[PDB]
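Supplementary Methods S3. Input chains for the assembly prediction are listed below.
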Amino acid sequence: FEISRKMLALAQKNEKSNIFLNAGRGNPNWIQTLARLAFVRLVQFGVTESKLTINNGIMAGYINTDGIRERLFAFLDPDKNDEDKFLIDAVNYCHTELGLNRDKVVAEWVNGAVANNYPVPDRCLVNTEKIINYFLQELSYKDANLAEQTDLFPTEGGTAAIVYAFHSLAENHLLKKGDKIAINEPIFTPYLRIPELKDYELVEVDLHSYEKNDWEIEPNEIEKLKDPSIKALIVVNPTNPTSKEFDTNALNAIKQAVEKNPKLMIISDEVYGAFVPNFKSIYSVVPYNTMLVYSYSKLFGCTGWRLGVIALNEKNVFDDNIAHLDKVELRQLHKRYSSVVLDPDKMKFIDRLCADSRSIGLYHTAGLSTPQQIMEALFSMTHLLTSTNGGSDDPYIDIARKLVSERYDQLHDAMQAPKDETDTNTHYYSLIDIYRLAEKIYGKEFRDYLTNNFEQVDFLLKLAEKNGVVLVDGVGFGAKPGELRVSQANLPTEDYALIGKQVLELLKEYYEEFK
Amino acid sequence: FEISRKMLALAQKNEKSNIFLNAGRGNPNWIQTLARLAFVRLVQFGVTESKLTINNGIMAGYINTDGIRERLFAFLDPDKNDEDKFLIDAVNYCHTELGLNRDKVVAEWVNGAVANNYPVPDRCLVNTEKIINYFLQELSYKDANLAEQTDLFPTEGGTAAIVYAFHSLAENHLLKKGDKIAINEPIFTPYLRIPELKDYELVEVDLHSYEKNDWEIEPNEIEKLKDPSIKALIVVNPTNPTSKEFDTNALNAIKQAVEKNPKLMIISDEVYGAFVPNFKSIYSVVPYNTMLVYSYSKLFGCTGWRLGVIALNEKNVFDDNIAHLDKVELRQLHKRYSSVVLDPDKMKFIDRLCADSRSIGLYHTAGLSTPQQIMEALFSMTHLLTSTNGGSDDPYIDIARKLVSERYDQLHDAMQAPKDETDTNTHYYSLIDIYRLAEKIYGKEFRDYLTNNFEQVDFLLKLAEKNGVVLVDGVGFGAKPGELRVSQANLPTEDYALIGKQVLELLKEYYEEFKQN
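Predicted C-alpha cells for the full assembly:
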C-alpha cells in the first residue's frame, strides 16, 4: 500500500498539503476557545500558588492541596471572565454530579496545568479519567451505562492510539502472523502501512445497505464478516473520506458476528462521531469486545495538542483471550511484565498498552503529558456542562455540524454535484465523481476521452493557478478514478462555492481541448 | 534486571513514592515560572487573533501570519507583565541573533500554543529547532560550534527518547541479537528492562580515576571500553544516583575509543548536565558518533510537560553504519521506508526515528505536540536571553544548583556524612553509606550485627513513623547494601537536616537494641 509517488512529489511543492493529500486528514480551521483559556488561568493560578513555598527570581515552588478550591475560587473573577465562570461551574459539577472532592480535582487540574509531576498513575489521572468516561458516554453511548465499568488510556492523538493498539496486540499474541482481520470500506490506508499488517491477511467488508437487496447488506459481505477465521475487526466509524456512520443493519451485523464469535476483537476509531446527530458507538453496542479509539482533534480543533484516548471495558475480550493462550505464551508474557509489576498474569491489557508504549522499562514515567490530560478534561467539561439531546449535542457541536454542512452545500451547489443529506453523513469530507459529472454535461464521448487522458496532478496544478496559489490545501483525489476528494475542514467557507465553479471551468477547458 | 519485589510492595502503600523508589527519579519540587506564564499569553493572544476570522459562541477561527508580530506587541503590556517583556525580548533575539523572521517566529509560537495544526514538519518545528539547537550548544557544547549542523527530534521526555532510540537501532540493523554494548557505572536499571536488551551482552565500564592507579582509569576498564566488539556505548552523564559528570580522563578515554573504532555508536543521556559548572557534553567531544538525549525536566521543574530532545549531527555514524550494511539488509530497509518517502536509501536516521515512532504508516501525523515544542522553545529562550560564563550558566540555573547543594549540605552536616564538594558533583542525589557511618559511631561489632540483620523496608517505615507520614518521598536505597539513597529534588529544604538527624536517631535505637540483648 505505497503512497502515490506523484502525490508524494506534489507535496514537495507545498508541504502544507502533505497531511490532506498523503495522510488523508482534514485539519480544521476552527478552534474551541473556552477550554484553551480555562487552561491559561489554571497555570496563572498555579504559578501564583507555587510562589508561596519558593519565590526566587523566575523560580517558584510547589502546591498544597488543602484549601486549593477556596483559593482558586477567590483568585478567579467569574463576573469579568467567561473562563473563570466555566472553571467554578466545572469543579462544582465534578462535585455535585460526579461525586468528586473539589480540592483533589482543583489540585489535579492545577498541578496538571503547571505540569510539576510525572503522570501518576501512569495510565490516566484519576479525576480526569472519570470526566472523560462520562463525556464519552454522553457523546456516543446513548442509553448504555458503561462510564463506571470503563478504563481509559490517554494517548498522543488517535495516531498514537492505533500504533500502541497494534504493537500491544502483537506483543500479547492476540495478533499473530497469518491472522485474518476485517476492515471496513474504504480502507484507511495509513493504518495498512503499519509494517506488521503485511503479516496479516486483510479482508475489506462493505456493510452498506443497497437497493440491489431489499435495502440490506450483501449476504456475501455478511459471510466475510462472520468468517470464523476473522480474529479482529478494525473500523473507522464514521468513515474517512466517505463520511458515513454505521446504520442499524451494520451495527446489527456486528453484534451478530460477536454473538457468533465471542472471541472477536474490535477496534473502533470514532473521531467523527460527534458530527452526526444521534451517534451510536460500537463500544456502546458490544462493550466486552471493543477497544474504543477517540480523538478530540477534529471536533475541538486541537490537532496540535495530540489528544487521543483508548477505552476498554474493565471486563473485556482482550484480557479473556490472553487468559486462554498456551501456557508457553503465558509464561513468556509473565516474564515480559514481571520486571515491573508484582502480578503480571492479572495485569489488564489497558495497563499493558501503557507499559508497552514505553518498552516496559520506562513504564513508571509513561503516560500522556498532564497538560494534554487536563486539556482533554476541560474540553470534556465544556460538553458535560452544556449538553442537550441526552448528551449527544451541545451548542458548540451544533455550530461545528452547521459549519461543515454549509461548506459542503456550498461546494456541491456550485458544482451541481449530488448531495447526501441523511443524518448518517458527517459532511466532513466530500467525494465527487468528476467523470459522472463530465458525462452529464458533455456526454459519453467526452467522459471516455477524459478517462483515458486525465492526470490528477495537472488538474490540481490548474486549480491552484485559478486561485493564485502553489497548491490548494484540502482538495485531492480518492481511491477511485475520477473521484475528487475535498475537506470541509480546511478552507474558509467562502472558498467552497469558488472551488465548485473552478471545477466546472476546468471541465469546460478540457472539453475545448478535446475539440 | 527486575524491580525489587519489596520496594514494589512498599510503593503500593504510598504510590507517590514509586517514581523515586522504583523508577529512580527525583521529581523536582520547584518550577521555572517565566516560560509557563509566557505560553499562557500566547494562547490568550492567539484566541484573540482567531476571533478575527470566526467568532461564534465558543468557536473561533484561524490566524494569519502577515503583521502578526506588530499585533502581538500591541497586545502585550511589557511595562506591567514580566512575561510580556520576555516575549518581546525573545522574539527580537530570534531576529537579531538567530536571523529569524519575526512574523514567522511569532506565527510558529502562537499557532503552536493555540495548537491548531498537526506538527509540521513531523520531526521538529523549524524555528524551534534553531532555538533549541543554540540553547543546547550554550548549555553543554563549550567551544564546539555545532548548532548549525545538528538535527533535532523532540520527544515525550527523555523517557520516550530512549525508547525510540533502542527501537530504531534494532529496526535499522545497527544493534542485533548477541551484540555487545558498553554502559557506564552505575547502570540505570530502567533502561536495562527494555526487552530487547535481554538479547545484547552488556559490559559495565567504570571510567573513574583512582588513587590505586596514578589518579587515572583502571587499565582493565579502558580495555573493556576499547574492546573491538563493543558496538555501542550507552551512558547517563552525569550519573543517577552517583551524580558525577565524566572528568577529563573519562572524556579522553571515550575520544580515544572513537579514534580506535570510528564506527562506535554513542548514546548520551545528559539531563543532569546543567547541575555542574562547565559541563562538557559527549556530543561536543565526539559529534559524529554521538546521539544526544536531553530533557528539560529536572532543571525547569517540568516533568509533567514531557519535554525531551534527540540530537544528531547532519553527518553521523548511524547513517554511515546503515550505508555499510548488506545488500539484503539495505533492500529490507528500502521497502520499509518506501511506502512513505520517495528516496528511502537517503533518509536520515533522525527522520527514521520519527517515522519508526509512529510505525511508519502514521509518520505524517508524527511528532511532539506543538504546545510541548513551544514550551521547549520558551524554556530555551529564557536561558539564551540571560546566559553567563560563556553559555553554561544563567540566573535560574545558578539558583537551582544552589538549592540542591543547600539541601545536600543540610543532609550531610546533620548526619555527619562525608561530602563531595567537587565541580563534578551535581548534588542532585546522595548515596550515603550507613554501614560505614554506624561503624564510625559505634564500632565494627555493631556494624557487623547491623549488616547481618538490617532490613531496608522496615528502616524506611521507621523513618516515615518519625515524620508522621506513611512513607517519606525521596528516601530509599542504592544498589549497594547499606547505602541510603536520597533525592535533593523532592522535599522542602527544611526536611534535609531533619532526615539526617533522624537517621542518626535510628542508628542509635538499633545500637541500643544490639546492646540490650
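Chain A touches chain B through 97 residues (CB under 8 Å). Residues 237 and 270 of chain A are 5 Å apart (CA to CA).
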